[model samples]
Target: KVYGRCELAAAMKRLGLDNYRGYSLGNWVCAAKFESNFNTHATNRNTDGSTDYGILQINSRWWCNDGRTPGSKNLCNIPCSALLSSDITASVNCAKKIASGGNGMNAWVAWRNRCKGTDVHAWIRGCRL
Candidate 1:
């Protein structure tokens, strides 16, 4: 399921993504906007042979067990297939795991380059948090 901005925002809110580790809900929203445009089944393949999965594009190399990334750490302990489901619970949880890492949201280059240092408030403006 593809989610609109506010829809995704509200979903994330219900899941406790807001300020999950010093990062705002808007940060999460904005990252999803650029990462996968809120598409629950979003996937991206890295030139390094890694694949990113789900809305936040959690990478296979260090986070998810894709079984093809070659030594996937599976730190999130979920199959990459789980991320493609319409149910985003696994995706959101894995994203939280990624955020808690040393890079925080910077784990996503798209987030750091686009979401960081920006006025993220607008991302969640219409959401009735």
Candidate 2:
């Protein structure tokens, strides 16, 4: 089933997804289907020497900057806003920015279009503030 609506919305909001890509909730849902099949605890063995975790597959260590363990960040339990106070938006935005550059829904679109990456559940946060 689909998951993390608020977190996805928050990511899209901070990532300028609404303004740039104008992707809707349905679009986000489609993206999740592409990424990890809604598996918040998904993981991918990156070709590089890093790991992606959780719903959005946030590299919490790199994205959060809060020094919190990736395991502590729980989905279906915690809020996405809790992802991090510093640059959670940046992290989410970075994901989009990296996957697709310049007025586009990068990772989400890629995840949906390609369906080749692994899904992790270590970073699904909520946006309940």
Candidate 3:
């Protein structure tokens, strides 16, 4: 499912993801926008031959596997397809794990490059969540 920005932000809030791993909700939303624009089925092939999966674009290299990617770590212990569902629980859980390692939102390059040091508060400005 493709979600509007506020819709996805509300969902993220409902998932109790605000300040996850010490990062603000805006950071998450901003990263999501850049990563997949809230498209659950979004996927991208990386330059390293690995693939990014789902809204958060979890990587096949260190997160989940799609069965075709070699040497996948599958640290989330789930198929990469699981991350592509409209239900974002699995992806959020995996992202929490990724952020837990002191990386915070830096686990996503989008966050580092775009959300970081920027006025990301607008990402959730009117979400009312």
Candidate 4:
């Protein structure tokens, strides 16, 4: 797990996560909180038979391959395991590609359901970066 939310925000900024593809850092932090609770190894299986991977909860439906499914698009061209890494480099790159799809942050259900239109300023509070 990460040391704290503040640390995560700093790491994100260094990764150039702020305002990426028009998405604010607050949105990314809040979404990550709900998606993985700041745990890089988090994974969840959806009822649709797809799995969500890493901090962003990127889904196998359109992003990575879990190797259990055939004909998977694997649009990001990275294995699902790559996203579960602590470094987050691969995950960030894949997330940027997803954001550039013109869907904004709507690709993440957590963002649309919980963070959308919410007051997210506190997400970056006390993080000087």
The candidate that achieves the highest lDDT relative to the unseen native structure? 3
- Stretches of model 3 off by over 4 angstroms after superposition: none
Q: Write the per-residue lDDT of candidate 3 for residues 1-129, one digit (tens) a residue.
A: 888888888888888788776677888888999989889899899888798989999999898878777565888998899999989888998888888887677889988998899978899887767
Between candidates 1 and 3, name the one with more favorable TM-score. 3
Extract clashing residue pairs from model 4.
Answer: none
For model 2, how big is the CA root-mean-square deviation?
A: 10.2
Each prediction's whole-model lDDT (CA): 0.85, 0.46, 0.86, 0.83
- Give me candidate 1's TM-score against the actual structure: 0.93
Question: Which has the better lDDT: candidate 2, or candidate 3?
Answer: 3
TM-score per candidate, in order?
Answer: 0.93, 0.42, 0.93, 0.91
- From the highest TM-score down, the ranking of the candidates is 3, 1, 4, 2
User: How would you encode candidate 2's per-residue C-alpha lDDT over 1-129 as one tens digit per residue?
Assistant: 234556555655555654344444445544554665565555564444445554556554344332345344332223333433333344345455444556454545544465323322222233441
Candidate 3: the clashing residue pairs are none
Give the 10-residue window scoring lowest on summed lDDT in candidate 3: 64-73
- Model 3: lDDT to the true structure: 0.86
Question: Candidate 1: what lDDT?
Answer: 0.85
Candidate 4 local lDDT, 14-128, one digit each (tens): 9898988777888988888987888988989877788899889888888898887544688899889998987878888888888888777888788888899997678998886
Ten contiguous residues minimizing lDDT sum, candidate 1: 63-72
